[PDB]
């Protein structure tokens, strides 16, 4: 039905969790969902629909980077009628305000990409999440006793930065971490009148300088997963 | 002291309400504050300290445009130890999602200014308010029976726009109204680790050409003033 | 009549002096003009008309920053038919060629604002004054024996710069001082086919760190004020 | 070994073929490569090593967009010591000079990404392939009776473009087709002193809206796979 | 001594006239100077020294475009000690206020070049002439009976514009004509603390679409030549 | 017929060699062409037509910098029907891989000019030569026993750089040398559907500190001249 998703129209629930990693999506379906069905698998980018403790949710992989993320989110909204999108990914810490393990809620996503300038009159689009979703996250995290760190992230076109000298400046301006997709998710959701939010877990520390294995990036962040499932349930 | 404020160190309370118009500031002190004292008046830009329901509150004018607002906000934080800054004003609505008398909570401020590019590595800074402050506005509005319109505003360097043809695109991307300062207030507060939020009253609709009568303008601004004072108690 | 000026349509003389500070404007009206009338006071931004040595002249406050200055200058030209606009402001010296209280005529106003890029095809607009006003300032200063310094100024969106490391480069390219409005004045007068010039007196010296008090910024510049009045005769 | 590749150093041969779709990578391994072995599978992004006409060749998936392709290419060169990278993909034709089923050698990759301005002093990096590899492709195509179409491609951050009105201009400047990775592959190989080339098969015509059937796409893709393997052996 | 000038250090007088065309330079030496000596001829770019009414004056060709003009003016100031540089060039009028053969004094040179952004912090440099020279031109034109038209020029990288639709906008903002060098002459003299002015004679009218016809462009601009020689005398 | 060329239509052969220096063009005409005729001479920018091994070839000066090169290339293609344009210029080496008098073939021309962003939607145009011409150069160089170095060049608006600290980064990205016209030649040829290529001989080595005299820049590069004539045969 679209070039990158081979689900039937109607296979997605209106609420969808997203990860860049399709194997994290697969792990979520197996560990937390019942009656789960793989609904799409083009380019190995898996998506699922199932029940979290009796309530329907969908999961979808979005690949790495703003261009990849934009592709999947565009199709989810425009073709698959998805209304609420919650990214739960990984990020690299740069700020003294946060530590490893920490879950960050991104109230803004700054970027070194040109995509928002192309979208938005070559001006500065402030890429932001839906407020209702951010409120629901905060309240749920409180209810569950999960100490959520709240601020900006910086969404980069680079995993391997050319601007490591600038991390302190970013931290000063309340950038808690760097990842590579939130500004894409936020701008696409704004374009298309949908509700989006990004949470991310600090697996890696860019200034100290720890890094999780590929396996730990799938398996270490059950608290963030539970937060997402609970807030969309 | 500073070139633009003649208050004594210690004259400002840590929480301050801000408006563009120093006569709106004056109006607030004269009507709503107990023991209101004028604390500064350089360039006729007035500021006050007083009490509301037993709580110390300051008020400060910030003039028009990001550059003017930045001066005042920088001085308030760095010299006068202001920690929480709540800006209230009118705007020009550009979205069908809002109408006359609506109060907007600006969860992002986009801009055509170069100021955030200068501050932030020539990249896109997502200028955002403090989350706790925004949560405090939402909960207070709920208590007061105000239905907050939440979304982005666009902060322009132009009152008389050369890009009116772009207003529908702005509205498409969840910009509910146009004003001239919020992106500056937000960036400055991000730079300086202070808590900021902007609320805007819809007095004019730039698309529908709706405009409130001079009397209902006084009544609607009073409603927004009450919201703000209630938030700072 | 306009949102920012409440003068009647023939209240301004075609020749108008401008200061960002409405209290310097008030000072000038009281000390130097006969039959001076306050003609506007919206947002506490004062303007006056009266006579100097028999000839009508107007005075108008323009606030701080290009965005503020543009609002006022646009309205003075379009609504009030002002033909000649002479800013007599303050600036921060960055060259040893000038000292505290020196008078500078800006033959060009460079800028870190995006406003002229937005106005002018995303190209470089060289913001410049009317040559005949500049000629008249030079000749009037020689006659009065006031030694006018002549060169570029840099019109910034920042009073508190993030680029102090660049001030030497700006001084190398013949920028004598930094102020915040000249580029906006010049571009607005260019757009609207009006005659403009900016003079500024040095109120801050960024080499020497000496800075005037707010009161001194009103009172210390009679030579600049007399120069301005004399060139309008 | 890296966050995105779980192969051991020594697993990749120094020549590697790249495709965006890891299922395409799998197909090539299963049909064309002797002793095909899966060597990486992080995020479902498959990579393989095996032999073609006696020559060791590796295959690696790179995902969609410049940011994703940059991650994988950086790690293949800097960790896995890959020296020669040949990307083969589909593209959307924009030029009258090409049509469906044509194979394009990209001698330049233009872009709407900011990545190369970030890499390269905010100037214009002309992102180009290694000349000797491009010569090898030309000679191998002639030998195989492939009428190789040669020109620029335009590497976009957008699959769903906001600038379809510009496709004719891009075609005028010798952009034969649009894809989403070549500028990244080229700039990364330039940075890291590796040899890279991108070939792409026209699967869709973005002007006429004609498109190959799924069967027709696999058949045209096979010709390009043979070209790539033959030039690497 | 330089790659572009084969004059000996000391061959140039400190006052030098400049044209893009070395054959205009030749014409001036032969018609207006006594004891003229050709002092440089690298790339056929002729320069001369001679006498006008007993005073030493030099002449130098500078080719077309900001980059060519910058080469020669940098060399003249830095190697050859030239102190005063007066360009007497040709331009294409975009204003109704000017006609064929009118002389324009450029009080500002706008540009579509990136050169000034490269030189000046990526901001807007207002490229302007030395005020004393401009005063000297104005007084000398007055004494001679020459009607000097005064305003900005637009210095383009394009003789054959891609933006002819924008000539009306350029004219609105007080650009009387388009040429290709003034912004570079002015920026280089500002860099290097030298005095520079640009005069240009209208050879082409781009609005009325009228032009001088080769014959004709030779003795056409004697008013400008003499004005220049008189101001250096 | 054009303001910059006074040749008659049909005076140019369809294959043209180009140098910035019209005296190098003159040298080539006298030393290597039979029955050579000077065909144009406007602004001392010479051009010729003659025969090599009985085949017609033309030669044209293009001056210095992209704006100048663009003027002449535009006129040669549009008015004079020139189909194949071969720049044989000079350049400043920034890589250890090349020495004084080495011949570089530019497979891309990076730039600090704004010209290609003006041309190309504010995006990155990858400025590249015609492939068949580059193939011809390579094969012809083999035939002659000339060792042709191949890679990118950086086309600057500056001979005297403000970014000398960036040379090592340009070299890292496979820029062998800096010159000032190739990106303009390439973009113009791309715009007008013509075949172009740039070869340049090293006249300055910016790393080792060699620099040829003006005479050497005319006379030292017979190998490059012979290569160019033989490739047009």
Tokens 């409440």 belong to residue: C6
Listed in sequence order, the residues at least 6 apart from B195 whose beta carbon sits closer than 8 Å to its beta carbon are B83, B84, B85, B130, B132, B133, B189
User: What is the C-alpha to C-alpha distance for residues F79 and C48, in angstroms, rounded to an integer?
Assistant: 62
- Across the strands, what pairs with A111? A155, B124
Put simply, the answer to whether D160 touches A71 (Cβ < 8 Å) is yes
F90, F217 Cβ separation under 8 angstroms: yes
User: What is the C-alpha to C-alpha distance for residues E9 and E120, in angstroms, rounded to an integer?
Assistant: 30
Listed in sequence order, the residues at least 6 apart from C53 whose beta carbon sits closer than 8 Å to its beta carbon are C229, C233
Provide the token pair at B115: 């100021």
Provide the token pair at C48: 């006056």
Q: Which residues in chain C are contacts of E108 at CB distance < 8 A?
A: 108, 126-128
CA nearest to A169, candidates B125, F153, F147, C51? B125
CA distance to B154, D113, D123, E75, per residue, from C118 (Å): 15, 22, 21, 35
User: What is the C-alpha to C-alpha distance for residues E125 and F162, in angstroms, rounded to an integer?
Assistant: 16
Burial of A223 (0-12, 13-18, 19+ CB in 10 A): middle
User: What is the C-alpha to C-alpha distance for residues E61 and E22, in angstroms, rounded to an integer?
Assistant: 5
Measure CA A34 to chain center: 22
Phi, psi of F199 (to 5 degrees): -110, 145
Provide the token pair at C163: 């680029």
Of E6, E66, E204, the CB nearest to F157: E66
C217, C101 Cβ separation under 8 angstroms: no
C7, C13 Cβ separation under 8 angstroms: no
Of A3, A67, A114, the CB nearest to D65: A67
DSSP assignment letter at F162:
S
User: What is the C-alpha to C-alpha distance for residues E164 and E112, in angstroms, rounded to an integer?
Assistant: 13
User: What is the C-alpha to C-alpha distance for residues D23 and D43, in angstroms, rounded to an integer?
Assistant: 13
Q: Which residues in chain E are contacts of F6 at CB distance < 8 A?
A: 214
* Cα end-to-end distance, chain D, whole Å: 28
User: What is the C-alpha to C-alpha distance for residues F216 and F211, in angstroms, rounded to an integer?
Assistant: 9
Of E23, E68, E112, the CB nearest to F114: E112
The strand pair at D175-179 and D84-93 is best described as antiparallel
CA nearest to C43, candidates C17, C2, C4? C4
Phi, psi of A108 (to 5 degrees): -160, 150
User: What is the C-alpha to C-alpha distance for residues C223 and C161, in angstroms, rounded to an integer?
Assistant: 29
- DSSP secondary structure of F63-92: -SSHHHHHHHHHHHHHTT---EEEEEEEEE
- DSSP secondary structure of E14-38: SEEEEES-HHHHHHHHHHH-EEEEE
Q: Which residues in chain D are contacts of A43 at CB distance < 8 A?
A: 20-23, 64
For A204, name the nearest residue in chain D, comparing CA atoms only: D3
F74, F5 Cβ separation under 8 angstroms: no
Q: How many CA atoms lie within 13 A of E49 on its CB side?
A: 15
F173, F152 Cβ separation under 8 angstroms: yes
Q: Which residues of C touch E (CB under 8 A)?
A: 105, 107-113, 116-117, 119-121, 123-128, 131-132, 134-135, 138, 150-152, 154, 163, 166, 169-170, 172-174, 183, 187, 190-191, 193
Q: Which residues in chain F are contacts of D108 at CB distance < 8 A?
A: 108, 126-128
C127: left (phi over 0), alpha (psi -120 to 50) or beta: beta
Measure CA E56 to chain center: 19
Q: How many CA atoms lie within 13 A of A198 on its CB side?
A: 37
* Cα end-to-end distance, chain E, whole Å: 28
B69, B63 Cβ separation under 8 angstroms: yes
- DSSP secondary structure of chain D: --SS--PPTTSS-SEEEEES-HHHHHHHHHHH-EEEEEEE-GGG--EEEEEETTEEEEEEE--SSHHHHHHHHHHHHHTT---EEEEEEEEEE-STT--TT-EEEEEEEEES-SHHHHHTTTSB------HHHHHHHHHHHHHTT---EEEEEEE-S-SS-S-GGGHHHHHHTTEEEEESSHHHHHHHHHHTT-EEEEEEEEEEETTT--B--HHHHHHHHHHHHHHHHHHH-
CATH topology assigned to domain B1-233? Rossmann fold (3.40.50)
The residue count for chain A: 233
User: What is the C-alpha to C-alpha distance for residues D68 and F233, in angstroms, rounded to an integer?
Assistant: 46
Put simply, the answer to whether B135 touches A138 (Cβ < 8 Å) is yes
User: What is the C-alpha to C-alpha distance for residues A129 and A109, in angstroms, rounded to an integer?
Assistant: 9
Put simply, the answer to whether C107 touches E116 (Cβ < 8 Å) is no
Provide the token pair at C168: 């030497």
The residue count for chain E: 233
Tokens 């000839």 belong to residue: C55
Measure CA B70 to chain center: 12
A190, A74 Cβ separation under 8 angstroms: no
The strand pair at A195-205 and A84-93 is best described as parallel
Q: Is B147 a catalytic residue?
A: no
CA nearest to E13, candidates E60, E53, E46? E60
Provide the token pair at F61: 């000066």
Of all helices (H) and strands (E), which one includes residue A110? strand A103-111
User: What is the C-alpha to C-alpha distance for residues E115 and E119, in angstroms, rounded to an integer?
Assistant: 6
User: What is the C-alpha to C-alpha distance for residues F204 and F214, in angstroms, rounded to an integer?
Assistant: 11
The three-class DSSP label of residue F195 is strand
F150, D131 Cβ separation under 8 angstroms: yes
Put simply, the answer to whether B190 touches A174 (Cβ < 8 Å) is yes
C153, C176 Cβ separation under 8 angstroms: yes
Of A20, A65, A74, the CB nearest to D160: A74
User: What is the C-alpha to C-alpha distance for residues D133 and D195, in angstroms, rounded to an integer?
Assistant: 7
User: What is the C-alpha to C-alpha distance for residues C113 and C154, in angstroms, rounded to an integer?
Assistant: 10
The three-class DSSP label of residue E50 is strand
Provide the token pair at F17: 């060699």
Alpha carbon dihedral A27, A30, A32, A38, in 10-degree steps, equals: 90
User: What is the C-alpha to C-alpha distance for residues A57 and D136, in angstroms, rounded to an integer?
Assistant: 51
Cis peptide upstream of residue A209 (ω within 30 degrees of 0): yes
The three-class DSSP label of residue B180 is coil
F59, F28 Cβ separation under 8 angstroms: yes
Provide the token pair at C67: 């965005």
The domain segmentation of chain C, as residue ranges, is 1-233
User: What is the C-alpha to C-alpha distance for residues F4 and F40, in angstroms, rounded to an integer?
Assistant: 9
- Across the strands, what pairs with C195? C84
CA distance to B32, B161, D170, D214, per residue, from D177 (Å): 65, 38, 9, 20
Provide the token pair at F130: 């015609």
Listed in sequence order, the residues at least 6 apart from B70 whose beta carbon sits closer than 8 Å to its beta carbon are B115, B184, B187, B188, C157, C158, C159, C160
The three-class DSSP label of residue C106 is strand
Tokens 């109006």 belong to residue: B27
Phi, psi of B47 (to 5 degrees): -140, 155
DSSP assignment letter at C130:
-
B95, B150 Cβ separation under 8 angstroms: no
The three-class DSSP label of residue F135 is helix
* Ordered alpha helix ranges (H), F145-198: 167-172, 182-191
D66, D111 Cβ separation under 8 angstroms: yes
Measure CA F11 to chain center: 21
User: What is the C-alpha to C-alpha distance for residues D29 and D57, in angstroms, rounded to an integer?
Assistant: 10
- Establish, for the pair of chains B and C, how many residue pairs have beta carbons separated by less than 8 Å: 131
Q: Is the dihedral of CA B42, B46, B52, B57 positive or negative?
A: negative
User: What is the C-alpha to C-alpha distance for residues E159 and E178, in angstroms, rounded to an integer?
Assistant: 9
Put simply, the answer to whether B157 touches C67 (Cβ < 8 Å) is yes
- F134–chain E nearest CA distance, Å: 27
CB atoms within 10 A of CB B9: 9
* Cα end-to-end distance, chain A, whole Å: 28
Put simply, the answer to whether E173 touches C138 (Cβ < 8 Å) is no
The three-class DSSP label of residue B186 is helix
Cis peptide upstream of residue E216 (ω within 30 degrees of 0): yes
Provide the token pair at D122: 């905010």
């Amino acid at each position: 039905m679209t070039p990158h998703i081979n689900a039937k129209i109607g296979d997605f629930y209106p609420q969808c969790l997203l990860c860049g990693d399709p194997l994290r999506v697969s792990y979520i379906a197996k560990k937390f969902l019942q009656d789960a069905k793989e609904i799409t698998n083009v380019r190995n980018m898996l998506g699922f629909s199932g029940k979290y403790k009796g309530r329907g949710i969908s999961l979808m992989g979005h690949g790495m980077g703003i261009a990849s993320c934009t592709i999947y989110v565009t199709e989810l909204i425009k073709t698959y009628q998805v209304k609420e999108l919650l990214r739960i990914g990984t990020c690299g810490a740069i700020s003294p305000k946060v530590g490893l393990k920490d879950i960050i809620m991104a109230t803004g996503a700054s970027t070194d990409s040109k995509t928002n300038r192309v979208r938005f009159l070559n001006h500065d689009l402030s890429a932001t999440p839906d407020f209702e979703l951010s409120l629901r996250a905060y309240q749920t995290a409180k209810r569950l006793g999960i100490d959520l760190k709240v601020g900006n992230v910086f969404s980069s076109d680079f995993f391997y930065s050319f601007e490591t000298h600038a991390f302190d400046l970013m931290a000063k301006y309340n950038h808690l971490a760097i990842e590579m997709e939130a500004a894409g998710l936020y701008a696409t959701a704004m374009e298309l009148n949908a509700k989006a939010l990004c949470l991310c877990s600090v697996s890696d520390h860019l200034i100290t300088k720890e890094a999780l294995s590929p396996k730990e990036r799938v398996e270490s962040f059950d608290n963030m997963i539970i937060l997402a499932l609970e807030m969309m349930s």
